[PDB]
Motif scaffolding. Structure first.
Motif, PDB file in Angstrom:
ATOM      1  N   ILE A  76       0.816  -1.206   0.000  1.00  0.00           N
ATOM      2  CA  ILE A  76       0.000   0.000   0.000  1.00  0.00           C
ATOM      3  C   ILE A  76       0.852   1.259   0.000  1.00  0.00           C
ATOM      4  CG2 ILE A  76      -1.759   1.317   1.158  1.00  0.00           C
ATOM      5  CD1 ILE A  76      -2.748  -1.376   0.219  1.00  0.00           C
TER       6      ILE A  76
ATOM      7  N   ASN B 215     -11.209  -0.157   3.629  1.00  0.00           N
ATOM      8  CA  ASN B 215     -10.996  -1.598   3.656  1.00  0.00           C
ATOM      9  C   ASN B 215     -10.729  -2.079   5.079  1.00  0.00           C
ATOM     10  OD1 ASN B 215     -10.039  -0.416   0.921  1.00  0.00           O
ATOM     11  ND2 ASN B 215     -10.340  -2.598   0.454  1.00  0.00           N
TER      12      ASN B 215
ATOM     13  N   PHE C 275      -4.313  -5.962  -6.906  1.00  0.00           N
ATOM     14  CA  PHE C 275      -5.547  -5.256  -7.141  1.00  0.00           C
ATOM     15  C   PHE C 275      -6.094  -5.384  -8.537  1.00  0.00           C
ATOM     16  CE2 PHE C 275      -5.688  -3.334  -3.070  1.00  0.00           C
ATOM     17  CZ  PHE C 275      -4.362  -3.233  -2.678  1.00  0.00           C
TER      18      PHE C 275
ATOM     19  N   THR D 124      -2.923   8.924   3.320  1.00  0.00           N
ATOM     20  CA  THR D 124      -3.426   8.058   2.266  1.00  0.00           C
ATOM     21  C   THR D 124      -3.589   6.624   2.786  1.00  0.00           C
ATOM     22  OG1 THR D 124      -2.323   9.429   0.631  1.00  0.00           O
ATOM     23  CG2 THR D 124      -3.041   7.256  -0.087  1.00  0.00           C
ATOM     24  N   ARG D 125      -2.723   6.215   3.712  1.00  0.00           N
ATOM     25  CA  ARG D 125      -2.826   4.873   4.281  1.00  0.00           C
ATOM     26  C   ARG D 125      -4.130   4.776   5.088  1.00  0.00           C
ATOM     27  NH1 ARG D 125       2.969   4.761   4.202  1.00  0.00           N
ATOM     28  NH2 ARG D 125       3.224   6.073   6.076  1.00  0.00           N
TER      29      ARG D 125
ATOM     30  N   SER E 184      -6.850   6.562   4.427  1.00  0.00           N
ATOM     31  CA  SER E 184      -7.919   6.545   3.436  1.00  0.00           C
ATOM     32  C   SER E 184      -8.189   5.096   3.081  1.00  0.00           C
ATOM     33  CB  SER E 184      -7.499   7.312   2.183  1.00  0.00           C
ATOM     34  OG  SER E 184      -8.542   7.315   1.224  1.00  0.00           O
ATOM     35  N   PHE E 185      -7.141   4.411   2.652  1.00  0.00           N
ATOM     36  CA  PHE E 185      -7.254   3.012   2.284  1.00  0.00           C
ATOM     37  C   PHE E 185      -7.810   2.134   3.409  1.00  0.00           C
ATOM     38  CE2 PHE E 185      -5.746  -1.272   1.890  1.00  0.00           C
ATOM     39  CZ  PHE E 185      -6.230  -1.574   0.617  1.00  0.00           C
TER      40      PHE E 185
ATOM     41  N   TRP F 156      -9.558  -5.933   5.894  1.00  0.00           N
ATOM     42  CA  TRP F 156      -8.140  -6.070   5.504  1.00  0.00           C
ATOM     43  C   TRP F 156      -7.152  -5.931   6.681  1.00  0.00           C
ATOM     44  CZ3 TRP F 156      -4.853  -1.603   5.794  1.00  0.00           C
ATOM     45  CH2 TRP F 156      -3.566  -1.773   5.258  1.00  0.00           C
TER      46      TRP F 156
ATOM     47  N   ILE G  18      -8.217   2.861  -5.760  1.00  0.00           N
ATOM     48  CA  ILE G  18      -7.845   1.878  -4.734  1.00  0.00           C
ATOM     49  C   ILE G  18      -7.487   2.562  -3.423  1.00  0.00           C
ATOM     50  CG2 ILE G  18      -6.036   0.268  -4.023  1.00  0.00           C
ATOM     51  CD1 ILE G  18      -5.807  -0.522  -6.905  1.00  0.00           C
ATOM     52  N   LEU G  19      -6.692   3.620  -3.530  1.00  0.00           N
ATOM     53  CA  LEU G  19      -6.247   4.374  -2.367  1.00  0.00           C
ATOM     54  C   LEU G  19      -7.313   5.321  -1.831  1.00  0.00           C
ATOM     55  CD1 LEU G  19      -3.748   2.979  -2.549  1.00  0.00           C
ATOM     56  CD2 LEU G  19      -2.765   4.954  -3.756  1.00  0.00           C
ATOM     57  N   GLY G  20      -8.471   5.350  -2.486  1.00  0.00           N
ATOM     58  CA  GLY G  20      -9.553   6.212  -2.054  1.00  0.00           C
ATOM     59  C   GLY G  20      -9.246   7.687  -2.194  1.00  0.00           C
TER      60      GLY G  20
END
Ligand SMILES: [Ca+2]
Lengths: 205, 206
Positions: free
Chosen positions: A7, B202, A51, B194-195, B197-198, B205, A73-75
């Motif tokens: 990520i 999710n 992904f 951003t981490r 956000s992900f 996860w 994916i990262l929103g």
């Protein structure tokens, strides 16, 4: 089953895709992405494949397509509401940060120190932490926590009770939050210490 | 051999804990006590300390003071590192005012390319032009906190490398290009953002 490291590399790949685009590059590859991100081409492909981004045979990846994919994916293709708790030196600094982007919008600033509560800031005014419960729900998903170590946990408590969804923690401590809440740490003292360790041990790195 | 990068991070946590135990007066700790406070198995704790040699067999409990000293020496915290900040923008200026660098980290310079910033007094110093890195870094500044806009990051890092810097704590959202004799640690708060956000999108996860 994606590993946490992947990520972080996607984030880096995306940043690289933005620079390529600005340069007007239409297609890139794993070899190039790897060179610019300092990782093997194989790794690049492995990360993307998790992904479902594979790209085209002998042609590679189309820059704008992979960018759309990663930003999704990262929103990052959403608009997230943000807030800062702890308007001290660093908090005030982050409030004027000009590189949050279109993906992250400051919608609140909070503190408990009366000297600060009331002070005007770009984008609004500093409100007392007590108002978090009537400001967070449906408006602020992420909160940047910038208070001294001894106060972080209790501040995180307010944040969680207020319905926060994620906390970017700058305090050198491990927050105890319910599992529905996401926490990410930005600890530079730890970073400084890792640098010290790495300088003394060159073969290690 | 050769410690896992993940262990080094844990040692840092262990130390912060021992520091807190010393403050409470606690004199004897243990792998199970250290583990619970740091939220890892006692096995992990014993394993992290294993990478480091000891006189006989390790492990009854640990004497706070002794363990503390050992870890500080391993982490290089018993040395006095010279630091400097490059890019006295809003973030660099905040870092300059930071009161918790400890006795291990000592600011000895503040640098910026904006001539409208040179001369500005700051906690424990004054802002100097980057052109002076080559004269101010040798022999007294080993670590540089880099806080310039993303587009000038690699450039500034080149000056620092040419100036003889030994390590860069990079705050800019980019991957720096530096000789292998120069260490780099990234403090990427935007990536953390951003981490998050992900992670919020999710949950299962994580
Ligand atoms: Ca001192």
């Amino acid at each position: 089953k994606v590993p946490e490291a992947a990520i972080s590399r996607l984030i880096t790949y995306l940043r690289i895709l933005e620079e390529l685009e600005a340069q007007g590059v239409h297609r890139t590859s794993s070899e190039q992405l790897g060179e610019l991100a300092q990782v093997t081409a194989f790794q690049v492909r492995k990360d993307l494949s998790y992904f479902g981004s594979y790209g085209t045979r002998g042609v590679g990846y189309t820059v704008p397509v992979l960018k759309r994919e990663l930003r999704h994916i990262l929103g990052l293709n959403r608009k997230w509401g943000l807030c800062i708790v702890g308007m001290g030196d660093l908090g005030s600094a982050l409030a004027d940060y000009p590189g949050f982007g279109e993906s992250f919008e400051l919608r609140g600033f909070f503190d408990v120190d009366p000297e600060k509560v009331g002070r005007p800031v770009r984008g609004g005014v500093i409100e007392h932490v007590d108002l978090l419960p009537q400001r967070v729900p449906g408006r602020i998903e992420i909160a940047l926590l910038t208070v001294p170590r001894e106060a972080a946990q209790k501040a995180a408590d307010l944040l969680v009770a207020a319905g926060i969804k994620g906390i970017l923690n700058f305090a050198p401590v491990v927050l105890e939050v319910p599992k529905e809440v996401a926490v990410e740490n930005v600890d530079f003292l730890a970073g400084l210490t890792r640098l010290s360790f790495a300088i003394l041990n060159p073969k290690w790195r």
